[PDB]
Design goal:
This is part of a larger assembly, with 1 copy of chain A, 1 copy of chain B, 2 copies of chain C, 1 copy of chain E and 1 copy of chain F. Chain B is of the alpha/beta class. Chain B contains 13 helices and 7 strands. The longest helix of chain B has 19 residues. By secondary structure, chain F is mostly helical. Chain F is about 85% helix and about 0% strand. The longest helix of chain F is centred in the middle third of the chain and has 26 residues. Chain F is rod-shaped and about 80 Å long. Classes of the chains: A mainly alpha, B alpha/beta, C mainly alpha, E mainly alpha, F mainly alpha. Bound molecules: adenosine-5'-diphosphate (ADP) and magnesium ion. Chain B: It is an enzyme of class 7 (translocase).
Chain lengths: ~250, ~350, ~55, ~55, ~150, ~50
């Protein structure tokens, strides 16, 4: 599909069971072992599989291939042999913890340790504008997360930084098998990063969101066709979205 | 086969947070001396006499004494009958006095008798296996004389292939169904050892036992924040059971992060709002412990069996706050929530 | 006066309890790093000696 | 509290009253009136005294 | 099929103002959002029934085609519209009652407007009268003004 | 002034919400007729799926 101008996606589930099925073949063929009885060429096994993912240019067709490998650590130690081979080959990691899974954060993505080194050059113009401040807003919250357990004698800026960090977190939680659209995603983030939620109670942020999304699908369908097709969010759509979340927030609690 | 169900047992920790399933592979983890043989003796007590079809017990590499306390606790309960043709249990035994070439072909002999009932007949079969770590270990002893370089910490190079060659016959096909409970020894309390940490791919419901709970007196010591299931699903267990299970794990995990403050500050210097989420969590820890039936000679207490509809309704009321007027001791080793207040008054009068 | 005398000594006595807990946290980081290397070294010898005698 | 807890052994019979829940919230003038009122209407008619504190 | 439009459910239609009955008006907008998504779940036209492939793939004939002959010429009668008229009937009586403010208070507007005409007349000259100033500021019977 | 507009406020309020009650019940018959045409195809698709 990459050779013929099309696009593709591949998922290896999982690559940490290929290095084990290859170690057994080595030690039965009497090859010299190494660290944790892996052979000397387990780096050459995973490198020439992930380097086949490429973004071709227009003279060859314009195809692509995207690769998502899954790697299982043991007790959260990424400094093992195979969790350090595949980390240094690829671009960025998504680090799912087990502590956040039981504290209510589902999907339990830790955004403190997750990176991507293509950066913001793969986001659309609508998503890039709102999430650039959200990434800065959440990163200021994780500095002051250790003051939440006993904090009431702090500055009003610090009480504000805690107040936005909890409510931005509730927007990030998501049920299973419910994938959204980018035009619906940018609207929910726009409702939170502007300041339209600092008076709503932190337990109601989930109920407010499922109510607000079913509204704008049926009653504002002509605005979510001018962010899908436009790609960016203009000044005309900035005012048009502004009275929408003010109309819904006014009469909401019923 | 692809269909999923729920098989009710009667244990409060198991049915609430990690439900078992008909025709599904179940695992019992934990170290040495925490209760893997007793908890697998409990499911022959509850499940095997109310079951229609037959049952097979394969004992692989355990003490030869404990194969006699099964032959003498199954004659006096009438499951094995020595006088006619109405018995319901077969037994296959290769214990820890055998040569190590014979502790690695007994588990293949257990699931050969249990394959006859599923295939040549059509009945619903159970299968209990204890222990199954002694299938891996008994192949790591004959290995170096067969001419093989060792892998990581000392196991054979063909570790995850002959394990996966036995564990693909214990399945539910379109000709029958095999429920299977297995006890899995974890060596010196380390679930990152290569023998227990590759059985996880073959199990639907894992029940991780723990020595840090058992040394509190909470019995059965099942870790709630480490046990999973594939049917903890609000489309299968309903939306009322689902928001109760996650409501218990959220208040237990938030209780863990509060213990780091009490070590420096103290209990009394906390606020009144989180002096309540501790006291709600401590009543949830103690309410999970249930007096077993086959552990009467340890305890002297009686055997309780709480149904499924009562386990949810017991835990809604501790979370909502309908029992904030009782001390913690009123829930220790009780059955349903009705006996939690009858035990509360009987402690009061002796002041 | 007494609630100012007390609230300033809570500031100092919680400051030396984070210097002494960060002075202790570097000395256990070196011992963790000597012991992390010594286990990769030790279980590498057991594989080599197991293959050489075979 | 921590005055009474230290002196609970040697001088448990020379206490008059003890006032707890002090220092969580900031002190005010009403709490200086609650203490000084109960120092009078106790039944102990005294004639000198002294106060010790940390200036 | 058939589908008619509606008006704006923006300001008036959620502010019906009952006796503190904002909950009943909130439920009125909640039915319009639910039915519009249920109308967005299914289209106006259903799928088509291929008849020719039914004869060959289900070629055990007779029992297959007799159900396909009876279910083809069937009819689907929709539900009745008996409650559709009586709910629209009470709108005709209340709309005749809602103009009572436009009927009764219209004279109350002009009487207040005529009161602004005579109020200009009374003030007059500074030194005007001792009885024309005795309309706004009051007088009474014996022993009213205590102070 | 404030009681003149109080006349006109209730005559634009009432005619909006008395046609919302026309169209909130109008959608209730389309979605129960569209699901009547759809369901009669569903229970004849079961027989088109069974005998194969
Ligand atoms: N119902 C129970 N609850 C808690 N502990 C138990 C129970 N039954 C037995 N034990 C404890 O478990 C220990 C080991 O029992 P057993 O299950 O036979 O061994 P293992 O799990 O190591 O095979 C015993 O010392 C006993 O005190
Ligand atoms: Mg045992």
């Amino acid at each position: 599909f990459r050779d013929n101008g099309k696009h593709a996606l591949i998922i290896y589930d999982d690559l940490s069971k290929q290095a084990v099925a290859y170690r057994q073949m080595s030690l039965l063929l009497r090859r010299p072992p190494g660290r944790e009885a892996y052979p000397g060429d387990v780096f050459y096994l995973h490198s020439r599989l992930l380097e086949r993912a490429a973004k071709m240019n227009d003279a060859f067709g314009g195809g692509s291939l995207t690769a998502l490998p899954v790697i299982e650590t043991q007790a959260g130690d990424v400094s093992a042999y195979i969790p350090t081979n595949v980390i240094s080959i690829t671009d960025g990691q998504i680090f799912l913890e087990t502590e956040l899974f039981y504290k209510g954060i589902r999907p339990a993505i830790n955004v403190g340790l997750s990176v991507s080194r293509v950066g913001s050059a793969a986001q659309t113009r609508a998503m890039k504008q709102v999430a650039g401040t959200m990434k800065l807003e959440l990163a200021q919250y994780r500095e002051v997360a250790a003051f939440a357990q006993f904090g009431s004698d702090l500055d009003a800026a610090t009480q504000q930084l805690l107040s936005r960090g909890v409510r931005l977190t509730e927007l990030l939680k998501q049920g299973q098998y419910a994938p959204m659209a980018i035009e619906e995603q940018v609207a929910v983030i726009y409702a939170g990063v502007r300041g339209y939620l600092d008076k709503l109670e932190p337990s109601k942020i989930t109920k407010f969101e499922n109510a607000f999304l079913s509204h704008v699908i049926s009653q504002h369908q002509a605005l979510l066709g001018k962010i899908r097709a436009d790609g960016k969010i203009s000044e005309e759509t900035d005012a048009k979205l502004k009275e929408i979340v003010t109309n819904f927030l006014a009469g909401f609690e019923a | 086969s692809v269909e999923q169900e729920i098989l009710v047992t009667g244990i409060k920790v198991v049915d609430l947070l990690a439900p078992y399933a008909k025709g599904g592979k179940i695992g019992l983890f934990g170290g040495a001396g925490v209760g893997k043989t007793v908890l697998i003796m409990e499911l022959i007590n509850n499940v095997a006499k109310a079951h229609g079809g037959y049952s097979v017990f394969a004992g692989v590499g355990e003490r030869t004494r404990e194969g006699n306390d099964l032959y003498h606790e199954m004659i006096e309960s009438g499951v094995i009958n020595l006088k006619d043709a109405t018995s319901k249990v077969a037994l296959v035994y290769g214990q820890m006095n055998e040569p190590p070439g014979a502790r690695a072909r007994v588990a293949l002999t257990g699931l050969t008798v249990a394959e006859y009932f599923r295939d040549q007949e059509g009945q619903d079969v159970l299968l209990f296996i204890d222990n199954i770590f002694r299938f891996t270990q008994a192949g790591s002893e004959v290995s170096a004389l067969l001419g093989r370089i060792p892998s990581a910490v000392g196991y054979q190079p063909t570790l995850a292939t002959d394990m996966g060659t036995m564990q693909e016959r214990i399945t539910t096909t379109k000709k029958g169904s095999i429920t299977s409970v297995q006890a899995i020894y974890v060596p010196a309390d380390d679930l990152t050892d290569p023998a227990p940490a590759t059985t996880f791919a073959h199990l639907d419901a894992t029940t991780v036992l723990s020595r840090a709970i058992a040394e509190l007196g909470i019995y059965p010591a099942v870790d709630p924040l480490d046990s999973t299931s594939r049917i903890m699903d609000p489309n299968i267990v309903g939306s009322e059971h689902y928001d109760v299970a996650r409501g218990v794990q959220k208040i237990l995990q938030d209780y863990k992060s509060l213990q780091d403050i009490i070590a420096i500050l103290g209990m009394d210097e906390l606020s009144e709002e989180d002096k309540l989420t501790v006291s709600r969590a401590r009543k949830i820890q103690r309410f999970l412990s249930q007096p077993f039936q086959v552990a009467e000679v340890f305890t002297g207490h009686l055997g309780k069996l709480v149904p499924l509809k009562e386990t949810i309704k017991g835990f809604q009321q501790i979370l909502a706050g309908e029992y904030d007027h009782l001390p913690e001791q009123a829930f220790y080793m009780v059955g349903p929530i009705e006996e939690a207040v009858a035990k509360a008054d009987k402690l009061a009068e002796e002041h | 006066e007494s609630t100012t005398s007390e609230q300033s000594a809570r500031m100092t006595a919680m400051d030396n309890a984070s210097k002494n807990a960060s002075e202790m946290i570097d000395k256990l980081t070196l011992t963790f790093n000597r012991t992390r290397q010594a286990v990769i070294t030790k279980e590498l010898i057991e594989i080599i000696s197991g293959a050489a005698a075979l | 509290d921590k005055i009474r807890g230290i002196l609970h052994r040697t001088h448990s019979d020379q206490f008059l009253v003890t006032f707890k829940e002090v220092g969580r919230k900031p002190p005010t003038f009403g709490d200086a009136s609650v203490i000084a009122l109960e120092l009078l209407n106790s039944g102990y008619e005294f004639d000198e005294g002294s106060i010790i504190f940390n200036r | 099929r058939k589908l008619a439009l509606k008006a704006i459910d923006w300001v008036a239609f959620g502010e019906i103002i009952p006796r503190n009955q904002k909950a009943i008006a909130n439920s009125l907008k909640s039915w319009n959002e639910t039915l519009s998504t249920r109308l967005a779940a299914l289209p106006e036209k259903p799928p088509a029934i291929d008849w020719a492939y039914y004869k060959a793939t289900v070629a055990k004939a007779g029992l297959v085609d007799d159900f396909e002959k009876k279910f083809n010429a069937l009819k689907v009668p929709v539900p009745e519209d008996k409650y559709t008229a009586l709910v629209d009937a009470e709108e005709q009586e209340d709309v005749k009652r809602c103009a009572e403010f436009l009927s009764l208070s219209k004279a109350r507007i002009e009487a207040y407007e005529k009161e602004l005409e005579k109020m200009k007349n009374i003030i007059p000259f500074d030194q005007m009268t001792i009885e024309d100033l005795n309309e706004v500021f009051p007088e009474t019977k014996l022993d009213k003004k205590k102070y | 002034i404030d009681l003149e507009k109080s006349q006109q406020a209730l005559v634009q309020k009432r005619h909006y919400l008395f046609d919302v009650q026309r169209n909130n019940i109008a959608m209730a018959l389309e979605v129960t007729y569209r699901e009547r045409l759809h369901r009669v195809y569903k229970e004849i698709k079961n027989r088109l799926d069974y005998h194969i």
